[PDB]
């Protein structure tokens, strides 16, 4: 996944 997608997965739980 792209870095932007990894961030999107970060803010899903935070």
């Amino acid at each position, epitope marked *: 996944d*792209s*870095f*932007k997608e*990894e*961030l*999107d997965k970060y*803010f899903k739980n*935070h």
Partner: antibody, heavy 118, light 111 residues
Framework: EVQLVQSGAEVKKPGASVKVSCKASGYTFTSQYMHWVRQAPGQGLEWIGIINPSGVHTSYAQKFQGRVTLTRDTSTSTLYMELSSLRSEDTAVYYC???????????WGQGTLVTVSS | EIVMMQSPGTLSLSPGERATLSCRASQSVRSNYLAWYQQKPGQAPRLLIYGASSRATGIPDRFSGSGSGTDFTLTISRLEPEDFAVYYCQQYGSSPPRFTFGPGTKVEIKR
């Protein structure tokens, strides 16, 4: 050409608050995360925080937690950086940078100098 | 946090020569997410290299990055007078979001 355009320089008394803006029109910007980086005169670059495309999610550096507020206006494609309780060490050129979908900051604004002087 | 180091502090070379800039990280940089930025006087930083070795759009082939883990290198072959600037290295991570810069290396051009 798509380009980040920041607001003009402001001089603020100590303890006052400052609000810097960054115009980020175009899909290249409105579909990506945006960052704020400051640079004290004669010093390196310091990351302030990051804001998501919708403007709902933010993450601030440990140093600026509780003092900075990142907001984003999607109807005008405008980003904002508010820093409260300005002290002398906050005097810096505040940059607004685009977070590439790959990670690095590939688009930068021209910068905004904030002078905290009595 | 991940502390970034750079060496040398100042580098002074002639046009056509090769400049070698070092960047050391306190931890291993996940996914080799290492970026190099060029900042000329009175200008904003400019992305030269991301992902340790990827040239950004518009960057000439003479700019080159390498390394993995904690040690990274930026090499500027065929130096030109326009290359006078300060060069910062930066790590970036996504989970959790982390962005820390190096102290910078001032590159001066002799003539």
């Amino acid at each position: 050409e798509v380009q980040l355009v920041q607001s003009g320089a402001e001089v603020k008394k100590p303890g006052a608050s400052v609000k810097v803006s960054c115009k980020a029109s175009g899909y290249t910007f409105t579909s990506q995360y945006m960052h704020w980086v400051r640079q004290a005169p004669g010093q390196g670059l310091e990351w302030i925080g990051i804001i998501n495309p919708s403007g709902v999610h933010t993450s601030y550096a440990q140093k600026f937690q509780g003092r900075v507020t990142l907001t984003r206006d999607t109807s005008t494609s405008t980003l904002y950086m508010e820093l409260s309780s300005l002290r002398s060490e906050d005097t810096a050129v505040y940059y607004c940078a685009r977070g590439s979908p790959k990670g690095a900051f590939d688009y930068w604004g021209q910068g905004t100098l904030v002078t905290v002087s009595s | 946090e991940i502390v970034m180091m750079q060496s040398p502090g100042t580098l002074s070379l002639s046009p056509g020569e090769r400049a070698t800039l070092s960047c050391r990280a306190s931890q291993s940089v996940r996914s080799n997410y290492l970026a190099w930025y060029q900042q000329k006087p009175g200008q904003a930083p400019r992305l030269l290299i991301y992902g340790a070795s990827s040239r950004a759009t518009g960057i000439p082939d003479r700019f080159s990055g390498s390394g993995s883990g904690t040690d990274f290198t930026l090499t500027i072959s065929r130096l030109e007078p326009e290359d006078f600037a300060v060069y910062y290295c930066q790590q970036y991570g996504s989970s959790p979001p982390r962005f820390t810069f190096g102290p910078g290396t001032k590159v001066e051009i002799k003539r």
